[PDB]
Each structure stands twice: as structure tokens, then as C-alpha cells.
Paper text:
Hemagglutinin (HA), the most abundant glycoprotein on the surface of influenza viruses, serves as the primary antigenic target for neutralizing antibodies. HA is a trimeric glycoprotein with each monomer composed of a globular head containing a vestigial esterase subdomain in its lower portion, and a stem domain17. Each subunit consists of a membrane-distal polypeptide (HA1) and a membrane-proximal polypeptide (HA2). The HA1 subunit is comprised of a globular domain (residues 116–261) formed by an eight-stranded antiparallel β-sheet motif that includes a distal shallow pocket corresponding to the receptor-binding site, surrounded by the five immunodominant epitopes (A-E).
Therefore, we collected cryo-EM data of both endo H treated HK/68 and Sing/16. Indeed, we observed significant destabilization of Sing/16 but not HK/68 following endo H treatment as seen from the cryo-EM 3-D classification results. By pooling the particles from the well-folded 3-D classes (100% of the HK/68 particles) we obtained 2.3 Å and 3.2 Å-resolution reconstructions of endo H treated HK/68 and Sing/16, respectively. Both structures were nearly identical to their natively glycosylated counterparts in the protein backbone. endo H treatment of HK/68 resulted in a similar uniform distribution of views compared to endo H treated Sing/16. Interestingly, by comparing the local map intensity around individual glycans between the GnTI- and stable endo H treated 3-D reconstructions we found that several glycans were incompletely digested by endo H, most prominently the glycan at N165, which retained ~10% and ~ 50% occupancy on HK/68 and Sing/16, respectively. For instance, the glycan at N165, which shows the highest apparent occupancy in both endo H treated cryo-EM maps, is also the most ordered as measured by local map intensity. Cryo-EM reconstructions demonstrated that enzymatic deglycosylation resulted in significant destabilization of the more contemporary H3 HA, Sing/16, whereas the 1968 H3 HA remained structurally intact following glycan removal.
Author numbering:
A (entry chain C), B (entry chain A), C (entry chain E): 10 to 326
D (entry chain B), E (entry chain F), F (entry chain D): 7 to 171
Write the structure that this text describes.
Amino acid sequence: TATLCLGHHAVPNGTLVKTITDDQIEVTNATELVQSSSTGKICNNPHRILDGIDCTLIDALLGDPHCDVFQNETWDLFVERSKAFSNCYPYDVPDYASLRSLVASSGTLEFITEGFTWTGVTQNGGSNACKRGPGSGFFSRLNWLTKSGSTYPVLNVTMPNNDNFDKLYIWGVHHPSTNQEQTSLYVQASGRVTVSTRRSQQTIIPNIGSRPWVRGLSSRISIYWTIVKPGDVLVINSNGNLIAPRGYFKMRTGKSSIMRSDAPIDTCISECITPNGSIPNDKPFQNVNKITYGACPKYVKQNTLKLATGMRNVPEK
Amino acid sequence: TATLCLGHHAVPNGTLVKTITDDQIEVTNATELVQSSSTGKICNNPHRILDGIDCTLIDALLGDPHCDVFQNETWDLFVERSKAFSNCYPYDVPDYASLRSLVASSGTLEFITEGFTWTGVTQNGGSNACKRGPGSGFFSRLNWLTKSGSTYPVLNVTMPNNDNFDKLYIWGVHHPSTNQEQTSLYVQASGRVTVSTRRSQQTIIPNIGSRPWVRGLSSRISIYWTIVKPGDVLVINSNGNLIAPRGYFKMRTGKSSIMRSDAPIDTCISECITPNGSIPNDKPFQNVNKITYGACPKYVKQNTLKLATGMRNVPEK
Amino acid sequence: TATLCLGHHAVPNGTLVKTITDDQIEVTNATELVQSSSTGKICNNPHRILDGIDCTLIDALLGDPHCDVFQNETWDLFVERSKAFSNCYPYDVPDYASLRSLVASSGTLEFITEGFTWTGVTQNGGSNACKRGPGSGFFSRLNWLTKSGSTYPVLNVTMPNNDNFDKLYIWGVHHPSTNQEQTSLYVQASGRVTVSTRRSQQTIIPNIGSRPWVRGLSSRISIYWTIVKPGDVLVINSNGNLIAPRGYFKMRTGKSSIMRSDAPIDTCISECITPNGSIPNDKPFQNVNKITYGACPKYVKQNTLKLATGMRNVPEK
Amino acid sequence: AGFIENGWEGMIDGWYGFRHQNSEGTGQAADLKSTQAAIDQINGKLNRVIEKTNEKFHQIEKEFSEVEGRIQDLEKYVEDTKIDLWSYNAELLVALENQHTIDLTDSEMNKLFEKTGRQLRENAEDMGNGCFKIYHKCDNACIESIRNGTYDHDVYRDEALNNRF
Amino acid sequence: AGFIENGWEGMIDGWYGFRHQNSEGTGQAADLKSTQAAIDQINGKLNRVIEKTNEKFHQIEKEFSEVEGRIQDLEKYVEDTKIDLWSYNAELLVALENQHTIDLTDSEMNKLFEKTGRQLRENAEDMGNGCFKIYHKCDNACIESIRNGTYDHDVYRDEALNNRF
Amino acid sequence: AGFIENGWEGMIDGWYGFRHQNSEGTGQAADLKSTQAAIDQINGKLNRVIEKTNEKFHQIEKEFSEVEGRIQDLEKYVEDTKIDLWSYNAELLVALENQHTIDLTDSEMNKLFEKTGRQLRENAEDMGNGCFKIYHKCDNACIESIRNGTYDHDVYRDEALNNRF
Ligand SMILES: *[C@@H]1O[C@H](CO)[C@@H](O)[C@H](O)[C@H]1NC(C)=O
Ligand SMILES: *[C@@H]1O[C@H](CO)[C@@H](O)[C@H](O)[C@H]1NC(C)=O
Ligand SMILES: *[C@@H]1O[C@H](CO)[C@@H](O)[C@H](O)[C@H]1NC(C)=O
Ligand SMILES: *[C@@H]1O[C@H](CO)[C@@H](O)[C@H](O)[C@H]1NC(C)=O
Ligand SMILES: *[C@@H]1O[C@H](CO)[C@@H](O)[C@H](O)[C@H]1NC(C)=O
Ligand SMILES: *[C@@H]1O[C@H](CO)[C@@H](O)[C@H](O)[C@H]1NC(C)=O
Ligand SMILES: *[C@@H]1O[C@H](CO)[C@@H](O)[C@H](O)[C@H]1NC(C)=O
Ligand SMILES: *[C@@H]1O[C@H](CO)[C@@H](O)[C@H](O)[C@H]1NC(C)=O
Ligand SMILES: *[C@@H]1O[C@H](CO)[C@@H](O)[C@H](O)[C@H]1NC(C)=O
Ligand SMILES: *[C@@H]1O[C@H](CO)[C@@H](O)[C@H](O)[C@H]1NC(C)=O
Ligand SMILES: *[C@@H]1O[C@H](CO)[C@@H](O)[C@H](O)[C@H]1NC(C)=O
Ligand SMILES: *[C@@H]1O[C@H](CO)[C@@H](O)[C@H](O)[C@H]1NC(C)=O
């Protein structure tokens, strides 16, 4: 006679996995399905990464003197840093978060200057709170209009959209610290700014008073925006406190976004970006972050998941 | 001896399905779980479908002269068309989308006229921008109040809810194009409209100025609404620019909704409506649209899913 | 020879469960995975439960005379009752729901009085609509400022945050019923209240007019709030209608929340609270409610789910 | 097995069955009990066992004609999240259901085989091709007795064992 | 099998076991190793293997007393979406878990049967009713030897084969 | 089985295979068809069978530096809901996939065993330890014939049955 024995391989040291019927079963091999680490750096390929160094996207949009390098810049991902700071005339943006989202998803700061004509007013006013070069200045994409001589007319300007794309207009309203400023700056006891299209309008009333001092100023500027579609018309009506647009930003649709991260950017390639740096995307899940951009693994709570890649390991003994 | 062979059937041409262990396995039969097509038409049964032909729900609500056919109409589903247009005094609705949602879910335009008494004012003013018949007109559910003789009193009117249901009041505020209109129309340099209940109030200040011309007018009307519950009271206070309610809409709860679609409506029966037309609901999933109404299959990305309805197909060879 | 029979146990009366291949299969034993009932009572352990008896969280925050017992109180869960009512000067809170959420999640009404100095005005005004003791009164955490003698100066007060935590300030704006009240109360034809920080500002304009009568008053107070972070500064500017803060609420982060329930509270222990009372948390699912607090089972639609805890039951016959 | 080597394209009166060869020639018949059992399990599964159609009415807007900011971003996010999760459920469910259909139908075939093998006992051998070699003369009445569960192995052992050994 | 024909309502000392008849009369005993194995798999499954209770605190409002418009519509939508998905997970999970419980307990029964069959080797025949016919005298000590895994088939073949053939 | 008692730490040319002892001494060889079948099923499963990576771009904000009220509460709620559901899917999926891997690899081992048993027919006995006792002289050429599916049991029965009985 003869003996024919059937069997399978085993390994000296296997690994444990979980099944429906068993909490821990040893298997010959298992792989890891959760990516739990990053390189600590953001890769600059294949996506276009724009490091706002000390700028926020809104300061870059408005034209803060330290952000002059971002004029007409584009990105797939705009990266904000914790060290970013503003250094211009103090301002606020009602619904800041929406404007930040609109610009971030458009993906561009391409700006086209338009021939707005403002008559009977002094154009291009600035402040020592926004120095540009050795003297006073202002945001590069805004025009601070003030009285001319002894008057300030009601401004009524029309700017039609005869193009085949949407135009984004950024404008604002000045808020003087006192009654003695508003009548020396734009000779008006009660200003108003109205900006409208064929479908909607926004009217803003300025609010006089001292705020905490920021960069030497107790006054503020509020930022507002409007979108004009092809065939529509932009109309601006004001009797004081207008921080006029100088033109429009071209709007786009696409894959562009924004992230907050202090990670450095390097010469490597990775499709998945998290605020902790780029991660591999060769696993179905990750627990590095919830904030991701690009071709990323799904975020899960688990730090580890082991998937058997082989059979039960039963040692010889 | 004898031979007894056991086996199973096979078919000349089977179909492929996916399993956990196999990417493609041939089976005798398989069914399709994703509904990927529509008839291109909306069925008028069992649901009540209201085709707004050239009307939007809001124009039907306000009383645009082309929408006079929708007075006191009801629906389970209101259908808006891409060809719909407005043709009345130009207007805007702050938070348009919420009003559209409220009315759509109520499911009715039933309107009850109330005995509001407006004294010292001229009632029923109209415009050539909203012609009704051969002459001027206005929205049928609104009352444009203007000066009487040389004055305009402050209007203070009270309308209690002694009923057992909620009342929806639609009202608005006029926005003149100029200082020379507001003092000839309702003799007032600065108008205000305040509408309130025992729980909340809304005060609107009119904004003077020219907007782009729509149907010959540079002026606008803003639409606002309030809901008065049983036991509450409606109070209206104004010193100019009031587009008064003429009564209330009766509010209801239920299955009613709204959809945007250019699909035609026909004499067929289907429980599931999508903007591409009605679809069968005999499959668990569909990929026709994400916008659905009624007893619909779940929307999935997949264009196809095959479910084996039989065993593996192994041909004789 | 001999017979050796192999088999398994059976029970006289088994239970039915559902599987992938069978709609109903009898098994020896099965357990219930859906918790479908409550005790009808809320347990006061391990969580700290604060029964607002006739108070809402906002009345407790503002200082309604019936809620004086909740001063400096804390909770893990604040419980509102359907019988709760207000009994003070009539008020409204724009975005009521957000303020209710902020306070509920902070978990405390700890209040610190600050040395605000209001000069040229009369402090601590009250009303017969908010009686405290036998005479007139007001909300305990607010200061109603009115004219002094024949004047009312513009108030400009600064209160810096030099602490290491966020400060919540509650303040409001008075809305007189008439032009004959606003000039006798705070001698001003047009009041305004501006409250600001280094990052944002709020300016409120009062609205004159009669509202439905509540507790004998046709006038109203609107409630607003602001948060001042460490290093920031609170600035208040007003020329009339200011219901001043008396200090700040200390903000916290944590597990605190709010629930609406008419269930009584008792001396028992339970980690899961629903508005129908506490429930056991020894099952993975529940269908008692969707509103839960603490270590609760997941809410499902199903009233029952049976999980086999044993084998198929096949009776002897 | 013979049911691994192939199926029968010539079997149309059921899903599972028998084919035979004896002194009277050849023949075929479906087994209706295993055919119906496989069918009942499948018809159940193809029905609303773990899922059903839900009826929905008013819902959020899913398409937009304007750029709005935060609320619209959240509405889109919520809808995309819902779709990804239901698309996942559909893939997993179909693959699980198909895995179970293949396994239940292979099992019904193996059950019929074991059922037959124990009826035959020692009077037949498993040839490794889904067939049993019966070691005694077994005419058409005998084959039907095996097919309907009434074969008595005790009246054949004396012949069958002589032919096997 | 006999374990398909029925279970034993008279077996209370375990889940799986043996029943026998010999020259000393009849008897019964549970098999504790297969009983415990089935129990351990089940007790694991009934525990937090793929799910656990999460502790939640402040959340969105889920009930409303007023008609608000878009935000409320989105809040309701989000909650309904969550409920439909968890209700689905509960149906699929329970049906999968029950499918696995039935399959693991049927398998433990079949494992005991095969285990017994190979201990007996050629000294016994499978009668098709979950029973083995043992072809040699097998007294109560013999039956326990089979039950505890110590049966030596080599001391019985000479008798058992004479009785089988 | 012997494949339950243990695996072979000495088998490195495949996953499943044969080990033998005969008159020429001992030896070992992997079975490549069952090894590859188990591998193909696993490599498929480890790939995007029921799931794939989705590419996402602009999304909602998930972290906040300020206390906002209702919108922020809803955004957080939506994200937590998404995470709990995907975390659940990951637990269930991995446990199901691991359950299927163990079951398919145990089944491939049992298939090789049954495949061998029916090639041997009556010329061998199952010893209960994953081994077949072959009752005829079977040299290295014979063992390879069994291993590659060409063993002819009809040329050995006359010897094998004399040794078995
Ligand atoms: C931005 O692009 C426009 C395109 O017409 C061009 O006119 C303008 O000069 C560019 N500005 C900068 C800073 O490059
Ligand atoms: C108002 O208060 C600020 C401090 O925040 C102070 O700097 C400013 O001079 C004050 N202005 C008036 C009107 O007195
Ligand atoms: C990176 O991961 C850590 C957890 O280890 C987390 O605390 C941190 O917030 C993540 N990165 C950022 C900047 O979001
Ligand atoms: C609408 O219904 C009300 C119910 O009282 C009725 O008075 C009114 O005349 C109806 N209007 C139309 C257009 O039918
Ligand atoms: C304001 O501009 C518009 C063009 O949009 C024009 O039609 C209107 O007459 C102008 N009005 C004034 C106040 O000059
Ligand atoms: C109908 O389906 C198509 C995809 O083929 C889609 O583009 C379209 O938007 C759907 N219908 C509507 C009007 O939503
Ligand atoms: C609330 O706590 C503060 C802490 O400084 C204390 O000054 C104040 O008196 C306390 N108030 C009450 C009602 O206990
Ligand atoms: C305004 O109407 C109310 C009723 O809501 C009444 O009590 C009040 O006296 C009226 N006031 C005026 C200004 O006549
Ligand atoms: C308690 O459960 C019932 C359903 O039986 C439900 O109607 C009720 O709303 C729940 N409790 C509360 C107060 O939410
Ligand atoms: C089985 O078939 C045989 C031969 O045709 C017949 O005599 C017997 O009665 C049948 N038994 C049953 C239960 O149908
Ligand atoms: C098995 O049972 C027999 C008879 O009772 C006994 O002699 C033997 O020692 C037992 N063996 C074990 C391992 O329990
Ligand atoms: C199987 O092995 C034998 C012995 O080595 C050899 O003669 C035969 O040709 C092989 N057959 C196949 C199909 O490889």
C-alpha cells in the first residue's frame, strides 16, 4: 500500500483578522485597508497647488498690498496658512464663508478692468492703514470714491453684460466712525448704496460709529458681491460711501477648491491631498482626515482594518 | 448494471452576473434591477398633475394676468416649464425658494378675500406693465394702495385669526425709481411697512432708485409673507409703499410638491414621476434622475445591475 | 450490530426569523433587537437633568421673574415642557433657534456682572408686564436704559476681554409703539444700536408701531447676541433704545444639550434619554423616537427584528 | 461531478433531474422537489425581502440655476452623500444576492446527489462524474423507485455486492 | 439525515449529540464540544462584532412647530435620509446574521456526522437517516469510545466486515 | 482532516498540495490548479469588486473656528452621519470579505480531497486525517498520475480490494 496526504501550507507567524463567525482568526497573510499616515507634505502634482503664503483667499481677491503676487492667479487647490494675516483698511464680509466658497470653486482671480465712469467724485482714495510702497494706498481691485470739491452727486452707472459668461463684481460700503467724517469725506448725512440687476437688488445703509481700533482705524468697510449673467445689466446707485468695483472677476466652473493647512509643498506626485499632507490612495479607507481633496480613500473612524489575503493559518505544532 | 446520472439544465446562451468571489459568472437567467429609461411623458394618474403652462408657481400665487386660470387650483404635483415667463409689474421675492416651497407643499391656491379696510388711501392702483384686458392692471391677489387727494395716513389694520387653520398672507413693498415718484404716489419722503403677529414682526424699508428696465419700468415690488395661526392676529402698519393683501391663502399639509420639467402630460397611469417623464416602479433602483416624486425606485449611479434568477450556466460543449 | 444516531435538540414551540434564502424559518431561540418601549420617565442619573418647569431656556437666560431659580444653573440636558410660558416684557429673538442651540450646548447660565458704566441715562427701568415682587420689573440680566432728565447722550462703552475664555453677551433693542413714546422715553426721533468687536459688527434700527397686545403691551424688545473672544473688545454705541447687557455668560464646550418632553423625572439610572422617557440601551436599535440623548440605540423604522440565537427548530411530529 | 462537467441543454421539464441508461435504453426526467425548492428561494429573494420601495413627496431642490454659496453647497453635499451610499448598497447587495443564488443552486444539486447516494447505499458507486454505477439490473420501474424515494436497497444487495466485489 | 427528519425534544444537556441502541438497551448523551462551538460563534455574533452603540449629545432639531422654508426642508431631508439608511442596514444585517446562524449550526451538525463516519471507517454504514449502522457488537463502553474520539476501528474490522459483506 | 489538524510549513511551491509515502520513500508537490483558483478569487476580491475610489473636489467646510448656530449644527450633523455610515460599511464589508476568504479557501481544500477520493474510488480509504490509504502498491509514477488526474482505478481494483477486504 501507500499513503497520499492532502493538505495546505502554513506559515511560522500569521496574522489575525475578524470574520462574521470569529472575532480573531489567524490567517497566512492579511493586508491593511486603512491609510493611517501622511508624508507631512503636500505634493505639487498632478493638481495645481497655490500656496497663499500670508494671504487668505479674500485678501487676494480684494487686493491687499501683500497679496499683489496673486493677481490673475489660478489654482486647483488654494492653500490657506495659519500665519496668514490682513494688513489693509479693516473690513468685514457679511456671509464671508459664501464668498470664500464662490471664489474657491471658480478657481481664478482673473480680473478685467471695466470703463466705469464716476463723475463729480474723487477717485482712488487710500489710507495709511493700507500702505502701498512708501505712501498710502488701498485694495487694488476697489475704488474708494469721495467728494469732489464741495459736492458728491448721486452716482448712477450702467454696465451691461454682452459677453458669454458670468461676471463677478466685488464692491463695498464704507462705515465712518463719526458724523464729522461722513460729511467731510462724502458730504452726506445719510448715505446709501444700491446695486442691482434685472433679477435682484441689494441696498446697504452705512452705520456710523466707533469700532475697536484696528491698524489705527476705528472705521470699517463691508464687502458685498453680485453676479451678472449674460444679457443682464449691472446698475450702481449711490449718494455716498461707495467702494466701487474697478471691473469684474471672470467666473468659471470646475474642480477647484480651498483647504487650510500648515503642511509644506514639495516636488512629488499624489492625487489625494489632506491638510496633514498628501496620502497614498491605494487603500479604500483612510483615517488621516475628514478634509480631503482629489482621488481620496473614504474617511473612517477605524485606525485599522485587516483583510485576509489567504487561508487560515494552522501551525504544525 | 445501470447508470443513473444526476444533473441540471443549461441554456444555449446565458447571461453574466457579478458575485463576491467572481467578477463575471454565466448564469441561466438574470434580471435587471436598474430602471434606465422613461416614457418621456408624465402620467396624469393616480396623482393630480397641474401643468403650469407659461406660469411659475409664484406668478400663479400673486395673480399675474396670464395665470388667472390657476385661481383656487389644487395639485399633488405642480409642474413648471422652461418656457414660463412673467408679464406683470417687475418684482422680487427675498428668499424666493422658501416661498416656492411653502406654497408647493401646501398644494393649493385657495384664496379667501377678507374685509380689510384701508382708509384715506386710493385702492386698486395698476400699471401698463401688467395689462389686464385692454387697460392697466395688477396682480389679482394684491392691492396697490396710493395717496388719496393730497394725503396718505398711517394705516393701522387688524385682522384676527378666529378660524381653526393657518392663514398665509402675501404682501409686498413698493420701491420707486425716484424721489419724485414716492412723493407723488404716496406723498411720503420715507415710507415703511410693518407687518406683525403676537410672536414675530417684519419691518421693511423701501429703497429708492433706478434698476435696469423691465417691461418699461425701472421700479420694483418686493414680496413678503407671514403666517397667522389660530388665536393669533395680523396687524399691518404703514405710512407708504404698501402692496396690501386682499385676503389669505388657506394652508394645508400633505403630499403635494413641485417639479421642473418640459415633458408632456398624458392619459396613462404611473405612481413615479421624474422630470424625464414617468417611469415604472417594478425595479428597486433607477438611474433616470435624482429628482423624483411618488412611489419611486432609489437613484443609483449604475446604469445596470444584474441579479441572477438561476444557476450557473455550464454548456454541454 | 448497534445503531448510533446523531442529531440535535428541538423545542416544543420555537420562533420565526428571516434569512436571505427564507422569509420565515423556525428556530429554537431568537432575540429582539429593537427597543420599542420606554419607562415613561426620565432618569436623573448618570446625566444631570435640569427640569425647566414653566421656563424655556431663553426665558431662563434672559431672567424672566418666574425663572429666577435657574440663575447660575448647569445641565447635561435641559428639559423644556409644553406648559412653559413667558411672563415678562414681550420679546422676540431673530434666529431664536441659534441662540437656543448656543446656550443649550454651552451647558451653563453662569453669569458674571461687569462694571459697565452708562452715563447720562437712567438705569434699571421696568414694566408692569414683568412684575417682580409686588411692583414693576424687568429681565434680571438686562438693563433698560432711558433718558435722564431731558437728555440721552450717545453711549460709547468699551469692555475688553482680558480673560482666557469666550464671553457671551446678550443685549437687545426696544421697539416703541409710537412716536409719542420714543421721544418721551429716550428723547430720540431715530434710535440705533451698534454692537461690535474687532472682527464683526451688528447695527440694529428700531421699528416704531403697534403690534398685537401681549400682557397689556403693544411694544416689543428684540434680543441679539455677540461673542467676544480673548484679546478682543466689546464696544457698544447707542443713541436710544438700548437694552444693555449687565455682564456676560461664560461659554463652555461639552456634552450638554436640550430636549422637549413632558415626561416626569425620577430616581433611576439610564444612559439613554428620549422625549418619551429613558430607555434601555442593551439592544442595537430602537423605534421609540428619533430624538435621543446619550448612549442610545440607533433609530429604525422597524418595530421588531428577530435575531436567531440558535438553530432551526424541527419538531419530532 | 457531471454537473460540474456540464449542464443539460436537453432538460426542459425542471432545473434539476435525472438521466439514465439501463437494459430498456435511455431516458430523462426532472426532479420536481429540488426544482421547486430552488425556485421558491429565488422568488423570495427577487422580492422585497430586505428592501422595499418608499414613497416620497416634497424634498429638497437638487438642481440649481444660480450660484448661492453655503446652503447650496450643503444641499449638494447631502444629495451626493445619499447617492454614494445607496449606490454602494446596490453593489454590495447585488453581489451578495448573486453569491447566495449560485451557492443555493449548487447546494440543491449536491443535496440531490447525496440523497440519491444514501438511497442506493452499497448497491452503487460514485463514478466521479455525477453518476452512480448501479451494480444490479435496474429497469425503468427501479429507476423511478429511486427517483421518487422508494428504492429498497435490501432487495438488491445480494446481487449488487457480487457485482461490486 | 435524521437531523433533517427531526430534532430531539428530549435532548436537554446540549445542542448536538448522540442517541443509541445496543444490546444493553438505549441511551442518549450530548456532545459538548460541538455544542460549545456553536454557542461561542453565536455569543460572539450577538455581541458588538460589526457594530456598537455610539454616544451622541447635541444634535439638530428633528421636530418643528412652524413652517420655515428651505432650512427646515433640508434638516428633515437629512434626518429622513439617515433613518432610511440605518433601517436598511438593520434589515440586511439581521437577515445576513440569521443566514449565517442557520448555516453554522447546520454545519456543526454535519461536521459531527462526518467526524463520526471516519472514526467508524468501514465498520459502519450510513443509513440515510442520520444514523450509522454499526456492524459489530458495540456495548456501552464502545459507544462512549466513539463519542469521546477513541474508537479503534482496527479491532472491529474482522467482525464488522463479515457482517457487512 | 489533516488539513484541520495542521497545515504544512514545509510547503512553499503552492497553497494546496499533496504529500506522500510509498516504497520509494516520501515526497511533496503543490497542486497548482487549486492554488491558482484560490488566488484568482482572492485577487479579484482585493480589487474594486463592490467599491471604488471616488474623486471629490469642492465640499462643505468640516472644521469651524467660531460658534454659529443652526447651519453649523447641520453641517456637523451631516458629516458625522456620513462618517458613521461609512465606518459601518467598512466593518461589515471587511468581516464579510474575510468570512468569504476563509470559506473559499477551506472549500478549495475540501474540493481537492473529494476530487482525489473519487479518482481512487474503491482502491483507497479515507483515514480521517486528510489522508488516503491506498491499498495497492503505488510508486512515484502512480502518485503523479493521481496528482495530474489520470489515475485509472480499473487497473488496481483486483489488488486493492484484496488488501482492503
Ligand atoms: C489679467 O487678465 C486681463 C485679461 O484681459 C488683462 O487685461 C490684465 O492686464 C491681466 N492682469 C494682470 C495682473 O496680469
Ligand atoms: C468711543 O470709544 C472708543 C474706544 O473703543 C474711543 O477710542 C473713541 O474715541 C470713543 N469715541 C467717542 C465718540 O467718544
Ligand atoms: C492631522 O491629523 C491629526 C490627528 O492625528 C488631527 O488632529 C489634525 O487636525 C489633522 N490635520 C489638520 C491640520 O487638520
Ligand atoms: C375660492 O374659494 C373661496 C372659498 O370661500 C370662494 O369664496 C372664492 O369665490 C373662490 N374663488 C374662485 C376664483 O373660484
Ligand atoms: C439711471 O440710469 C438708468 C440706466 O440704467 C437710466 O435709464 C435712468 O434714466 C438714470 N436715471 C437718472 C437718475 O439719471
Ligand atoms: C433626464 O436624463 C438626462 C440624462 O440622460 C439628464 O441630463 C436630464 O437632466 C434628465 N431630465 C431632467 C430635465 O432633469
Ligand atoms: C454666579 O457666579 C459668579 C461667579 O463670579 C458670582 O459672582 C455670582 O454672584 C453668581 N450668581 C448667583 C445667582 O449665584
Ligand atoms: C393700532 O391698532 C391697534 C389694534 O391692533 C390698536 O390697539 C391701536 O390703538 C391702534 N393704534 C393707533 C395708532 O391708532
Ligand atoms: C413617543 O412615541 C410616540 C409614538 O408612539 C410619538 O408619537 C411621540 O411623539 C413620542 N414622544 C415625543 C414627545 O416625541
Ligand atoms: C415510485 O415509482 C414506482 C414505479 O413506477 C411505483 O410503483 C411507486 O408506487 C412510486 N411511489 C411513489 C411514492 O410515488
Ligand atoms: C472514552 O470512553 C471509554 C469508555 O468509557 C474510556 O475507557 C476512555 O478512557 C475514554 N477516553 C477519553 C479520552 O475520555
Ligand atoms: C501524469 O503523470 C504520469 C506519470 O508521471 C505521466 O505518464 C502522464 O503522461 C501525466 N499526464 C498528464 C495529463 O500530465
